Amino acid sequence: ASIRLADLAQQLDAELHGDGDIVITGVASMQSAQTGHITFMVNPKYREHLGLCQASAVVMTQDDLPFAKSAALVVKNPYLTYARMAQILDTTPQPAQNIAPSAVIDATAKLGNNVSIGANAVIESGVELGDNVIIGAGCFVGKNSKIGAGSRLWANVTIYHEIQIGQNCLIQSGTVVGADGFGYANDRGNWVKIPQIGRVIIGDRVEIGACTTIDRGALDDTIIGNGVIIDNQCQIAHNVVIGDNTAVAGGVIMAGSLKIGRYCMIGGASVINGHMEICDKVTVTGMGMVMRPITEPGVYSSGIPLQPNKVWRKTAALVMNIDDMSKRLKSLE
Amino acid sequence: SIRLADLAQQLDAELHGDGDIVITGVASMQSAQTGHITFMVNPKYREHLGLCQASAVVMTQDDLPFAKSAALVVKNPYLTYARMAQILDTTPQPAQNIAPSAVIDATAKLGNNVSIGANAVIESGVELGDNVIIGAGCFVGKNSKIGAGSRLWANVTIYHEIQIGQNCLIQSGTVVGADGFGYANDRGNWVKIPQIGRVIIGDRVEIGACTTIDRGALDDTIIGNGVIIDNQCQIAHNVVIGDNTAVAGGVIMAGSLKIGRYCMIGGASVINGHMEICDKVTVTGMGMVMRPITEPGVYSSGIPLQPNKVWRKTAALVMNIDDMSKRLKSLE
Amino acid sequence: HASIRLADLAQQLDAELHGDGDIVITGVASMQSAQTGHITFMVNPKYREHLGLCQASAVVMTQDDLPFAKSAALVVKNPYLTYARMAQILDTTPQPAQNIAPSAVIDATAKLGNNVSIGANAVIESGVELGDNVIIGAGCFVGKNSKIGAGSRLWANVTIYHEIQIGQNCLIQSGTVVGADGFGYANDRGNWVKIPQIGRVIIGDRVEIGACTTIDRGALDDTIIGNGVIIDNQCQIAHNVVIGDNTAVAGGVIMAGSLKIGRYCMIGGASVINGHMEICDKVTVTGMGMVMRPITEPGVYSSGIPLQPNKVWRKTAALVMNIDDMSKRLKSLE
Amino acid sequence: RVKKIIGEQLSFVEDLGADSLDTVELVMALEEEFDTEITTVQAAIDYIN
Amino acid sequence: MSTIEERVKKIIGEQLSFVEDLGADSLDTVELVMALEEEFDTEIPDEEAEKITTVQAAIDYIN
Amino acid sequence: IEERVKKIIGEQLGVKQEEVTNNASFVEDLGADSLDTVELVMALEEEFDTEIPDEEAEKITTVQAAIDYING
Ligand SMILES: CCCCCCCCCCC[C@@H](O)CC(=O)O
Ligand SMILES: CCCCCCCCCCC[C@@H](O)CC(=O)O
Ligand SMILES: CCCCCCCCCCC[C@@H](O)CC(=O)O
Ligand SMILES: CCCCCCCCCCC[C@@H](O)CC(=O)O
Q: Which Pfam family is an annotated match for this chain, by its short name (chain C)?
């Protein structure tokens, strides 16, 4: 909690300009910060707003320092410095503290040192929890599943059998990992189930949001690269493969057997077709209708934005009949 | 079970029939029978009312002519329907008493007539108001505060430092106060931004199932009074929803979005972040909300279905609408 | 672990065995990853020329595939189907639970059938009926007076509300909610007055439901899921939705209230379907479908303009907005 | 003659069930049939005549 | 100048049996027909467009 | 003409005239979004009855850059 500004500036490799004996109690926004609070500023436009901010210290760039109206920590990337200093003064609790007796742990489960299991959490057989692992309350970890060192589950997370989670991963509540993929063969109208015997491999330093679903593979595995981040309400179907350090926002639906490359950034509520591949360093804007593969990096977009209803009604009808007008235009030529 | 006359007064309805009739529950026109009360709202349904074997039918003063049984005359049948369905509600409670199976921290303070279901978990510092019900398998994080009369169905997740008002209802699978999607890009790599903000939910808020409302980064995410949220919704960090605004199913909201009050977000709508939507706005289904909305009214988007072979042509011509625009001008 | 003679398997699958029938099969795998002791399959004729690269002991294929075979072959007419069958015979998938867990909470009014298993910390309410061979996953909740037919299975952390009826041989993945209040509210001068949902969810036989999907109870009448229906993850089935037998709903579909879907339909993922309407039989809706209106004739239906490079889309978008402008210029050009 | 067309496409909204796209599309269909470049049946019949 | 065959092949290569050997989308075969219509200033009835499933078939139509 | 182009920017971009200075960037100073710069070009094309090739439209990121094209 409470720390000294000068010491804090050292841990952030920052340029302390002002009283170093200033005691910082926490982090806050410009709008809201008071005394004991350190904040930051990423946009140059909010330079004037520094004279309305009751914060003790503001993280800015060297070119912002003339505008400073308080103590200042200068850096190259205020936003990254915010991330770091926020971690130091992080008020966030843990999913649990050590092993709750309320839990139901199978005798064959192999625990690391300093493992925590939440209340009424259920661990199946053959499960291996690494060192400093934290299982939130009401969680369920399936048979023979591996969770790497320092990884943590919030309350009510579901991990199926044979799942492999790397080191220092975080999973928010409601999320389900390793459920049957949507695999069905058709016999004369009837659906015959295709047992999904693949798994989910999750790399290191992967963070998944809440109420997200990553299905196990049909035969081979579903793989999440390292340093990957996924938001809430995402659907990641069987046999999808995601490259290291890729980002997926909220509400993304991925079809099966999709390969997403490294350092991609998938916009929210986007919808991605399957059995195809996306190259490295691709950015799909929100609500992206990704019907085709993407071979070259860059930004891709789709979807007509909002219009007033009466305007839309007429916009929609003309597009639906755009072929008719394309023809009566071709004739006019 | 109630008498039609004692029912007619609780709904402030003009009774037009035998007031000593016994009512037992609510049902639809097409399937209601003796013992049941129903309603109709569409004028077209008048010439078919006699076929309804309901004991009594809620309607208007204008529907009264076509009445074919005991009538309850009101201004808003749908509203009257809602209240008479509440009086005759058959829905149970998520829990009664406090379960021995439930795990409750010592530092947690409970009100009166509080119920906690089986195997539910209550962390430290939690305040539960009077007549508050926590369904089975639920989780309530540290220092979270749940106001009076609020109910959680089975398997709900409340994180730490969350504030729920009075008379709220949260369905199952729903998560409140999970880390917002906050990450700094350290040269390709993602560094986590701890989300130390909160979720403030007001009074009379109802939330559907498998919905996620994230805590704010530093400042708070706010769900105003009387707001209704459906299933499968994503309400990101630092979103602020005005009072009595309604959010239908499958809606994806970006962070730092401000929605005014009395707004209606159609389902599967997708709303961009860091902008405002003013009061009294309706967004239709599958809405693509890219820009702010400054004045009230209805806003829509999307090109609907066509037979597959037709769509193909529609699609390809639009993707080349530019060329088609060039052709148009060159002919002027 | 499983183990079976290639001959026995060929017989169980009704296949023409081309090769050593004494080969022992231990499981099923992909061509890329297959090992000795594994069987695989081939549907796409592009993989023909590659068949030599495979280390599988046997490959399931067709008659026209046999010439390119470089292993023992199980010839059939529909490989993807026999793959599905043999995948079942060699299934490794464990059970949601075995026997009754002590930590579980089962009300004494609960009627439990024969050979029923309930996992750890699961919660069975009053008046519940669980048929024979039913498996309730750990951490589940089953509301008052709900019945689950024999053979049906719930994985961990599934939520079933009250008065919900599930047929037999059903399967529901974790995170899924069945029987929650439909989105029913009456408006009184700005404010929302709740409409209690006293209807139910009726789920048929051999129905499979994905993870974190929500199927709401009807307002008065019932929400009905036909037999053989399969529903993927992240789906929303509104109150009073009726879905016909053998229809498929892929992931992330948003269904409105009082929607009726016929039999043998395929609703593509991320599709969004309006309410108080009907979709006929044998209808296929492609992904990201914007089903604004009823469908009366069988067939394939689609909507949506796919991706373009951002700079291109900016201009494509802006133009479609100004489309009424176009048709006024064109008409004036006549 | 006009009325048969209305029936094919489908007060339009209050009695005949129209959606938001249909009333616009209905106007468009009349433009083609009658080659010429309104919320009820009667309004359409009288103007067009 | 340029032969018919060469012009057809050039259009195909730029746009991308179309579906099996090459890898057509539900749009590409349509877009290909439209591009062929433009290059050769001709209208292709969908009954015939529907018959264009190979490289040769495209060559054949124009021929 | 300078004034007229500038008037369009204010209407399209929604800013008072005093803010639309010659050295101002549409995106960086004036808040413009993914579609406004395109819509602005469209508005200029209509007002001044001219077709702007995309190689050049892409280089018009400030008002002054816009004034110069139009004068030419
Ligand atoms: C032109 C830029 C459009 C961006 C496309 C969507 C970016 C993909 C979302 C990744 C989420 C991270 O970014 C984390 C954050 O931002 O909180
Ligand atoms: C259609 C316009 C684009 C709409 C983008 C919607 C993306 C939704 C992202 C939700 C995840 C948030 O946690 C990310 C944030 O903090 O924003
Ligand atoms: C073409 C897009 C049509 C818009 C679809 C909106 C779907 C919204 C989900 C409705 C959830 C139901 O529980 C409420 C209801 O529907 O009564
Ligand atoms: C742009 C059209 C693409 C539409 C794809 C929608 C996403 C499909 C949901 C994933 C379902 C998978 O579990 C089944 C599969 O696909 O294997």
A: Hexapep
Q: In this structure, are C83 and C221 located in the same domain?
A: no
Burial of F34 (0-12, 13-18, 19+ CB in 10 A): buried
Smallest CA–CA separation between B54 and chain A, in Å? 39
Cα(B224)–Cα(B213) distance, rounded to whole angstroms?
13
Alpha carbons within 13 A on the beta-carbon side of A229: 21
Q: Do C198 and B325 touch (CB under 8 A)?
A: no
Please indicate if any CB of chain C lies within 8 Å of the CB of A184: yes
As beta bridge partners, residue A294 has: A278
| Amino acid, single-letter form, for residue B131 | N
Identity of the residue in B193, B272, B297 whose CB atom sits nearest the CB atom of A308: B297
Please give the Cα distance from C27 to C3 (Å, whole number): 7
C-beta separation of A130 from A113 below 8 A: no
Dihedral of alpha carbons D31, D36, D38, D43, sign? negative
Domain boundary among A73, A98, A123: A98
Beta strands in A145-189, from DSSP E residues, in sequence order? 146-147, 152-153, 158-159, 164-165, 170-171, 176-177, 184-187
Nearest to C190 among B99, B244, B268 (CB): B244
Residues A91, A116: one domain?
no
Give yes or no: residues B293 and B239 share one domain. Answer: yes
Chain B residues inside the 8 Å CB shell of C312 = 322
Which residues are B241's β-sheet partners?
Answer: B223, B259
Q: In C69-88, which positions are buried (b, 16+ CB within 10 angstroms) versus exposed (e)?
A: bebbbbbbeebbbbbbbbbe
Are both C146 and C183 inside the same structural domain?
yes
Instruction: Name the residue with the closest Cα to ligand 1, atom 2.
Output: A285
- Residue minimizing CA distance to atom 12 of ligand 3: C238
CA angle B174, B179, B185 (to 5 degrees): 140
* Alpha-carbon gap: C214 to the closest alpha carbon of chain B (Å): 7
- Helices H, strands E: what count in chain D? 3, 0
Q: Would an 8 Å CB–CB cutoff place F1 in contact with chain B?
A: no
**Element housing C231 (H / E):** strand C230-231
Domain that holds residue B48: 1-97
Token pair, residue C167, equals 């047929």
Cα–Cα distance between C172 and C153 in angstroms, integer? 7
Closest approach of C15 to chain D, Cα-based (Å): 53
Rounded to the nearest 5°, which phi and psi values hold at B172? -75, 155
Return d(Cα C158, Cα A159) in angstroms, integer: 13
CATH of residue B27's domain is 3.40.1390.10
Centroid of chain to Cα F29: 13
Check CB contact under 8 Å for D15 and B304: no
| Token reading at B254 | 């970006």
Residues C34 and C156 in one domain: no
Instruction: Note whether D35 contacts A: Cβ–Cβ < 8 A.
Output: no
Tokens (6 digits) for B166: 């009075």
Output the CA–CA distances (angstroms, integers) from residue F45 to B201, C70, C315, F39, in the order listed. 49, 66, 14, 10
Q: Which of A65, A98, A131 is the last residue of a domain?
A: A98
A–C CB contacts, 8 A cutoff, strictly below? 220
Resolution for this PDB entry, in angstroms: 2.9
Which chains does B contact via 3+ CB–CB distances below 8 A? A, C, D, E, F
This entry's atomic model was obtained through X-ray
- CA–CA gap between residue A254 and residue A274 (Å, rounded): 7
Domain tally, chain A: 2
Amino acid identity, position A215 = D
Regarding whether C114 and C74 lie in a shared domain, the answer is: no
The catalytic residue positions of F are 33
**Which ligand 3 atom sits nearest the alpha carbon of residue C290?**
1
Does D19 qualify as catalytic in the annotation? yes
Same domain, C86 and C129: no
Q: Are residues A179 and A230 in the same domain?
A: yes
